[PDB]
Design an enzyme around this catalytic site. Structure first.
Site: not given
Ligand SMILES: Clc1cccc(OCc2nn[n-]n2)c1
Ligand SMILES: [Zn+2]
Ligand SMILES: Clc1cccc(OCc2nn[n-]n2)c1
Length: 257
Positions: A61, A91, A93, A103, A116, A195-196
Site C-alpha cells: 500500500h 509513510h 501517500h 489525502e 504521515h 485513512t486506510t
Molecule cells: Cl502504523 C499505521 C497504522 C494504520 C495505518 C497507517 O497508515 C495509513 C494511514 N492512516 N492514517 N493516515 N495514514 C499506519
Molecule cells: Zn497515511
C-alpha cells in the site's frame, strides 16, 4: 484485499469496514477561511533527537519507515495533545501526477504527496491498544509540493529500488526524520481517523501549514514502486490516497492567525 484500484478502492471500503461512513473520518478538506485560530492550543513539541529508525518496508500500500518505540525516543507532545505520543513509523501517500496525491486538501487544493508521521499515546501501553481509543494516535501530516529537492528525503528515495515489491524490506538505521520537516510548525488540528482500513476513529490530526518541497525526480522514484509482490504483473504504486470525507460535526482549529 482492500487497496486503491477501481475494484478495491476507497468507494468499496465501507462494505468490509462500515466505519468508513462514520462521524469522524479522515482525510478532510481544510477550509482555511472556516478554520478558527485557537489561542488555547499549547505550543507543538516535536522531539526527534533520539529517534531510532530500523527498517523500511513495502507493505503493498505504501512504504513504511519503522522506528523503535519500546521507549520514549522520538515523541510528539503539546499542541492539542495531552500527554506523550511515541513515533512508531512514517509513510507517504502520493499521486500518479504532480496535481494529486495528498489525502488532506487545503481549500480543495491537492498536493503531490503527503507525509504521515504516526505516533501513539503511551498511556495506552502499546499501539494495538491505542487504536481502540479516541485519543490513541496523533498523526503529523506534512504536504509535499514539487519544486526544489529535499535533501533529508534523498536517503529514502535512494533505498526504494531495494524494496520495489510488496513484502520487501531493507535495513534503514540511522535515519533522522527531522530532515523531513518544514521550517514552521504552524498547523491545523481536528479529530479524525486512520485513512486506510480499519479506518478507526482514533487519531488527533495535526497537519502542518507549510509544505515541504521535493524534486520531480524524488517523487518520480516513489512512483516506480509496485503494489504487487515479486513475480506478479506490475501495478505501479501510485494514487495510494483516500479522498476527502465529510467534515460532519467537527471544527478544524488553527494554531496561527
Ligand atoms: Cl502504523 C499505521 C497504522 C494504520 C495505518 C497507517 O497508515 C495509513 C494511514 N492512516 N492514517 N493516515 N495514514 C499506519
Ligand atoms: Zn497515511
Ligand atoms: Cl536531519 C536534521 C534536521 C534538523 C535538525 C537536526 O538536528 C538538530 C539538532 N538536534 N540536536 N542538535 N542539533 C537534524
Amino acid at each position: 484485499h482492500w487497496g486503491y484500484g477501481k475494484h478495491n478502492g476507497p468507494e468499496h471500503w465501507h462494505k468490509d469496514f462500515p466505519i468508513a461512513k462514520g462521524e469522524r473520518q479522515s482525510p478532510v478538506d481544510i477550509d482555511t477561511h472556516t478554520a478558527k485560530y485557537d489561542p488555547s492550543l499549547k505550543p507543538l513539541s516535536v522531539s526527534y533527537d533520539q529517534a531510532t529508525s530500523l527498517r523500511i518496508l513495502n507493505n503493498g500500500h505504501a512504504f513504511n519507515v519503522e522506528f523503535d518505540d519500546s521507549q520514549d525516543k522520538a515523541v510528539l507532545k503539546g499542541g492539542p495533545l495531552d500527554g506523550t505520543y511515541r513515533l512508531i513509523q512514517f509513510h507517504f501517500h502520493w499521486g500518479s501526477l504532480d496535481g494529486q496525491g495528498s489525502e488532506h486538501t487545503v481549500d480543495k487544493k491537492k498536493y503531490a504527496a503527503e507525509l504521515h508521521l504516526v505516533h501513539w499515546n503511551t498511556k495506552y501501553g502499546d499501539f494495538g491498544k491505542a487504536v481502540q481509543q479516541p485519543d490513541g494516535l496523533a498523526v503529523l501530516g506534512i504536504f509535499l509540493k514539487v519544486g526544489s529537492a529535499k535533501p533529508g528525503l534523498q536517503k529514502v528515495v535512494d533505498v526504494l529500488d531495494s524494496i520495489k515489491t510488496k513484502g520487501k524490506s531493507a535495513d534503514f538505521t540511522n535515519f533522522d526524520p527531522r530532515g523531513l520537516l518544514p521550517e514552521s510548525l504552524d498547523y491545523w488540528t481536528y479529530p479524525g481517523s486512520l485513512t486506510t482500513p480499519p479506518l478507526l476513529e482514533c487519531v488527533t490530526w495535526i497537519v502542518l501549514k507549510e509544505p515541504i518541497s521535493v524534486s520531480s525526480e524524488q517523487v518520480l522514484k516513489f512512483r516506480k514502486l509496485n503494489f504487487n509482490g515479486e513475480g506478479e504483473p506490475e501495478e505501479l504504486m501510485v494514487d495510494n490516497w483516500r479522498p476527502a470525507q465529510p467534515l460532519k460535526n467537527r471544527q478544524i482549529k488553527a494554531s496561527f492567525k
